Motif scaffolding. Structure first.
Motif, PDB file in Angstrom:
ATOM      1  N   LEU A 142       0.820  -1.206   0.000  1.00 43.77           N
ATOM      2  CA  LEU A 142       0.000   0.000   0.000  1.00 43.77           C
ATOM      3  C   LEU A 142       0.856   1.259   0.000  1.00 43.77           C
ATOM      4  CD1 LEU A 142      -2.000  -2.313   0.909  1.00 43.77           C
ATOM      5  CD2 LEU A 142      -3.211  -0.515   2.128  1.00 43.77           C
ATOM      6  N   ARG A 143       2.008   1.231   0.674  1.00 44.99           N
ATOM      7  CA  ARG A 143       2.856   2.417   0.717  1.00 44.99           C
ATOM      8  C   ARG A 143       3.577   2.675  -0.596  1.00 44.99           C
ATOM      9  NH1 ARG A 143       7.137  -0.100   5.088  1.00 44.99           N
ATOM     10  NH2 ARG A 143       8.012  -1.695   3.701  1.00 44.99           N
ATOM     11  N   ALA A 144       3.506   1.752  -1.549  1.00 45.03           N
ATOM     12  CA  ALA A 144       4.141   1.954  -2.842  1.00 45.03           C
ATOM     13  C   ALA A 144       3.410   3.024  -3.640  1.00 45.03           C
ATOM     14  CB  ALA A 144       4.169   0.646  -3.626  1.00 45.03           C
ATOM     15  N   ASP A 145       4.169   3.792  -4.418  1.00 43.99           N
ATOM     16  CA  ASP A 145       3.601   4.804  -5.309  1.00 43.99           C
ATOM     17  C   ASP A 145       3.477   4.184  -6.696  1.00 43.99           C
ATOM     18  OD1 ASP A 145       2.703   7.046  -6.599  1.00 43.99           O
ATOM     19  OD2 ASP A 145       4.487   8.262  -6.204  1.00 43.99           O
ATOM     20  N   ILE A 146       2.253   3.813  -7.063  1.00 43.67           N
ATOM     21  CA  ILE A 146       1.970   3.149  -8.330  1.00 43.67           C
ATOM     22  C   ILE A 146       0.958   4.014  -9.066  1.00 43.67           C
ATOM     23  CG2 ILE A 146       1.318   1.035  -9.487  1.00 43.67           C
ATOM     24  CD1 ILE A 146       3.264  -0.059  -7.874  1.00 43.67           C
ATOM     25  N   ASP A 147       1.431   4.799 -10.028  1.00 42.00           N
ATOM     26  CA  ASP A 147       0.550   5.595 -10.871  1.00 42.00           C
ATOM     27  C   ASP A 147      -0.030   4.702 -11.957  1.00 42.00           C
ATOM     28  OD1 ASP A 147      -0.596   8.171 -11.595  1.00 42.00           O
ATOM     29  OD2 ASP A 147       0.719   8.096 -13.352  1.00 42.00           O
ATOM     30  N   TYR A 148      -1.338   4.484 -11.908  1.00 40.54           N
ATOM     31  CA  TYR A 148      -2.007   3.556 -12.804  1.00 40.54           C
ATOM     32  C   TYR A 148      -3.060   4.299 -13.600  1.00 40.54           C
ATOM     33  CZ  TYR A 148      -5.637   0.297 -14.286  1.00 40.54           C
ATOM     34  OH  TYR A 148      -6.595  -0.378 -15.002  1.00 40.54           O
ATOM     35  N   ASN A 149      -3.120   4.023 -14.897  1.00 38.67           N
ATOM     36  CA  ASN A 149      -4.191   4.585 -15.703  1.00 38.67           C
ATOM     37  C   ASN A 149      -4.476   3.652 -16.871  1.00 38.67           C
ATOM     38  OD1 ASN A 149      -6.132   6.468 -16.693  1.00 38.67           O
ATOM     39  ND2 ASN A 149      -4.944   8.118 -15.746  1.00 38.67           N
ATOM     40  N   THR A 150      -5.381   4.088 -17.742  1.00 41.03           N
ATOM     41  CA  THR A 150      -5.972   3.223 -18.744  1.00 41.03           C
ATOM     42  C   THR A 150      -6.343   4.038 -19.971  1.00 41.03           C
ATOM     43  OG1 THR A 150      -7.872   1.828 -19.282  1.00 41.03           O
ATOM     44  CG2 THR A 150      -8.183   3.515 -17.598  1.00 41.03           C
ATOM     45  N   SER A 151      -6.515   3.339 -21.086  1.00 45.47           N
ATOM     46  CA  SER A 151      -6.941   3.967 -22.325  1.00 45.47           C
ATOM     47  C   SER A 151      -7.580   2.911 -23.210  1.00 45.47           C
ATOM     48  CB  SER A 151      -5.771   4.643 -23.046  1.00 45.47           C
ATOM     49  OG  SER A 151      -6.222   5.372 -24.176  1.00 45.47           O
ATOM     50  N   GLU A 152      -8.464   3.357 -24.094  1.00 46.53           N
ATOM     51  CA  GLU A 152      -9.097   2.483 -25.071  1.00 46.53           C
ATOM     52  C   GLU A 152      -8.816   3.009 -26.470  1.00 46.53           C
ATOM     53  OE1 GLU A 152     -13.224   1.972 -24.235  1.00 46.53           O
ATOM     54  OE2 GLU A 152     -12.884   1.019 -22.289  1.00 46.53           O
ATOM     55  N   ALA A 153      -8.389   2.117 -27.358  1.00 38.47           N
ATOM     56  CA  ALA A 153      -8.127   2.452 -28.750  1.00 38.47           C
ATOM     57  C   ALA A 153      -9.278   1.914 -29.588  1.00 38.47           C
ATOM     58  CB  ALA A 153      -6.794   1.874 -29.213  1.00 38.47           C
ATOM     59  N   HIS A 154     -10.044   2.818 -30.192  1.00 42.42           N
ATOM     60  CA  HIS A 154     -11.108   2.427 -31.107  1.00 42.42           C
ATOM     61  C   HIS A 154     -10.502   2.243 -32.490  1.00 42.42           C
ATOM     62  CE1 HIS A 154     -14.083   3.576 -28.024  1.00 42.42           C
ATOM     63  NE2 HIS A 154     -13.279   4.600 -27.803  1.00 42.42           N
ATOM     64  N   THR A 155     -10.319   0.996 -32.896  1.00 40.23           N
ATOM     65  CA  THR A 155      -9.768   0.655 -34.192  1.00 40.23           C
ATOM     66  C   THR A 155     -10.842  -0.010 -35.041  1.00 40.23           C
ATOM     67  OG1 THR A 155      -7.939  -0.444 -35.328  1.00 40.23           O
ATOM     68  CG2 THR A 155      -8.956  -1.608 -33.484  1.00 40.23           C
ATOM     69  N   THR A 156     -10.486  -0.271 -36.297  1.00 40.50           N
ATOM     70  CA  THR A 156     -11.447  -0.791 -37.257  1.00 40.50           C
ATOM     71  C   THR A 156     -11.996  -2.151 -36.854  1.00 40.50           C
ATOM     72  OG1 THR A 156     -11.600  -1.693 -39.496  1.00 40.50           O
ATOM     73  CG2 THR A 156      -9.391  -1.458 -38.540  1.00 40.50           C
ATOM     74  N   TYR A 157     -11.323  -2.852 -35.947  1.00 46.99           N
ATOM     75  CA  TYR A 157     -11.780  -4.143 -35.454  1.00 46.99           C
ATOM     76  C   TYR A 157     -12.135  -4.098 -33.971  1.00 46.99           C
ATOM     77  CZ  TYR A 157      -9.712  -5.508 -39.880  1.00 46.99           C
ATOM     78  OH  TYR A 157      -9.390  -5.601 -41.213  1.00 46.99           O
ATOM     79  N   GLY A 158     -12.644  -2.965 -33.496  1.00 44.92           N
ATOM     80  CA  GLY A 158     -13.159  -2.911 -32.142  1.00 44.92           C
ATOM     81  C   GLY A 158     -12.324  -2.103 -31.173  1.00 44.92           C
ATOM     82  N   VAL A 159     -12.457  -2.396 -29.884  1.00 42.17           N
ATOM     83  CA  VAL A 159     -11.803  -1.640 -28.825  1.00 42.17           C
ATOM     84  C   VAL A 159     -10.638  -2.461 -28.296  1.00 42.17           C
ATOM     85  CG1 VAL A 159     -12.108  -0.432 -26.638  1.00 42.17           C
ATOM     86  CG2 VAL A 159     -14.013  -0.591 -28.259  1.00 42.17           C
ATOM     87  N   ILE A 160      -9.476  -1.825 -28.173  1.00 43.07           N
ATOM     88  CA  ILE A 160      -8.290  -2.450 -27.599  1.00 43.07           C
ATOM     89  C   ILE A 160      -7.971  -1.714 -26.306  1.00 43.07           C
ATOM     90  CG2 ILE A 160      -5.905  -3.117 -27.947  1.00 43.07           C
ATOM     91  CD1 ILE A 160      -6.279  -3.369 -30.776  1.00 43.07           C
ATOM     92  N   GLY A 161      -8.007  -2.433 -25.187  1.00 39.69           N
ATOM     93  CA  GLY A 161      -7.766  -1.825 -23.888  1.00 39.69           C
ATOM     94  C   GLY A 161      -6.294  -1.872 -23.516  1.00 39.69           C
ATOM     95  N   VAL A 162      -5.800  -0.764 -22.973  1.00 34.24           N
ATOM     96  CA  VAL A 162      -4.408  -0.645 -22.562  1.00 34.24           C
ATOM     97  C   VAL A 162      -4.382  -0.147 -21.128  1.00 34.24           C
ATOM     98  CG1 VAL A 162      -2.172   0.364 -23.049  1.00 34.24           C
ATOM     99  CG2 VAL A 162      -3.723  -0.151 -24.914  1.00 34.24           C
ATOM    100  N   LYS A 163      -3.786  -0.935 -20.239  1.00 31.62           N
ATOM    101  CA  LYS A 163      -3.593  -0.565 -18.843  1.00 31.62           C
ATOM    102  C   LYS A 163      -2.110  -0.336 -18.594  1.00 31.62           C
ATOM    103  CE  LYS A 163      -7.377  -3.510 -17.205  1.00 31.62           C
ATOM    104  NZ  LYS A 163      -7.696  -4.593 -16.239  1.00 31.62           N
ATOM    105  N   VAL A 164      -1.778   0.731 -17.871  1.00 29.06           N
ATOM    106  CA  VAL A 164      -0.388   1.055 -17.575  1.00 29.06           C
ATOM    107  C   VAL A 164      -0.239   1.281 -16.078  1.00 29.06           C
ATOM    108  CG1 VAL A 164       1.525   2.605 -17.988  1.00 29.06           C
ATOM    109  CG2 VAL A 164      -0.021   2.047 -19.839  1.00 29.06           C
ATOM    110  N   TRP A 165       0.668   0.529 -15.458  1.00 29.34           N
ATOM    111  CA  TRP A 165       1.126   0.762 -14.094  1.00 29.34           C
ATOM    112  C   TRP A 165       2.548   1.302 -14.150  1.00 29.34           C
ATOM    113  CZ3 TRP A 165      -1.158  -3.292 -16.244  1.00 29.34           C
ATOM    114  CH2 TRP A 165      -2.358  -3.776 -15.718  1.00 29.34           C
TER     115      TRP A 165
END
Ligand code: MG
Lengths: 81, 211
Positions: B177-200
């Motif tokens: 819990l005391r660790a500093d972990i900046d986490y976020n997310t993004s979705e890429a709308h491409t011609t074949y749907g949604v590609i999810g990207v998670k980054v820690w």
């Protein structure tokens, strides 16, 4: 005395005495109005009416304190119109 | 299995809230709704300005929006014009008067949201997923991330069956819990749907906490 001449000061009148004795015997804080306070530490500050504490015989006037210009309540005696 | 949101679990320990104001029950929901509308508008209007974080505070009868971005000059425009127009429309959305501040994120490659945005943009702009994610870790470790992990997921390259793939360098302790972990997310709308990207991104531990 006050009269026509200093040699003979004059009385007032017959009916004037009666009127003076007659008298001797015998206002709403509109919302939005900008007021000043009458007493207290916040006396004589630029406040503005914010709400109506009417049936309490009281008042509430916004004022500009610590940037958090706070909802501040006053006595009815604290108006200056 | 299913893991708790890192920022969510760490809020109040080593992470600050994005929204920081007080409100009674009579206006809490209204403030949240206005916040959502303002953040949506600003994010769309500044989609191409590398905006990393929108901190909304509500001092008295006003709203201060702080935009953490990696490209302050674009957001500001010549002599503040763009800031002025953004403020003038945020004031409309909020109802109360508005002020806008701009905070530069010095090293964007260590910002989870910006990294996710870069990877998503590349995927939409037709790039190899493996190349993109490997390039972002390498850059993150170069700039000095104590650890980094990227997870791409869903119909990679137009494959019929969606698959999940993730790279991880350094150390990313998600149970600390005391660790500093900046986490976020993004979705890429491409011609074949949604590609999810998670980054820690793990950027060191915090002992004193300081909330
Ligand atoms: Mg669970």
């Amino acid at each position: 005395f006050i009269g026509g001449t200093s040699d003979r000061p004059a009385p007032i009148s017959d009916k004037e005495v009666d009127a003076i004795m007659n008298r001797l015997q015998q206002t709403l804080f509109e919302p939005g109005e900008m007021v000043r306070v009458n007493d207290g530490p916040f006396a004589d500050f630029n406040g503005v009416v914010e709400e109506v504490d009417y049936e309490k015989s009281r008042l509430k006037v916004s004022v500009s304190i610590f940037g958090r210009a706070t909802p501040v309540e006053l006595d009815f005696s604290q108006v200056e119109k | 299995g299913q893991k708790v949101h890192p920022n969510g679990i760490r809020l109040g320990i080593v992470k600050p809230w994005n929204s920081t104001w007080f409100a009674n029950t009579k206006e809490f929901a209204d403030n949240l709704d206005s916040d959502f509308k303002v953040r949506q508008y600003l994010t769309k209007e500044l989609a191409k300005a590398s905006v990393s974080r929108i901190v909304i505070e509500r001092p008295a009868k006003s709203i201060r929006v702080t935009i953490h971005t990696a490209r302050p000059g674009i957001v500001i425009g010549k002599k503040g014009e763009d800031v002025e127009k953004l403020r003038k429309v945020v004031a409309d959305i909020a109802g109360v008067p508005a002020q806008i501040n701009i905070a530069e994120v010095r090293k964007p490659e260590l910002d989870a949201k910006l990294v996710a945005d870069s990877i998503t943009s590349q995927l939409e702009r037709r790039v190899m997923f493996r190349r993109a994610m490997k390039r972002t870790v390498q850059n993150a470790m170069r700039l000095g991330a104590k650890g980094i992990k990227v997870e791409v997921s869903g119909r990679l390259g137009g494959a019929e069956i969606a698959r999940t793939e993730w790279y991880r360098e350094g150390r990313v302790p998600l149970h600390t819990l005391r660790a500093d972990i900046d986490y976020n997310t993004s979705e890429a709308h491409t011609t074949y749907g949604v590609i999810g990207v998670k980054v820690w991104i793990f950027k060191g531990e915090i002992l004193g906490g300081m909330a």
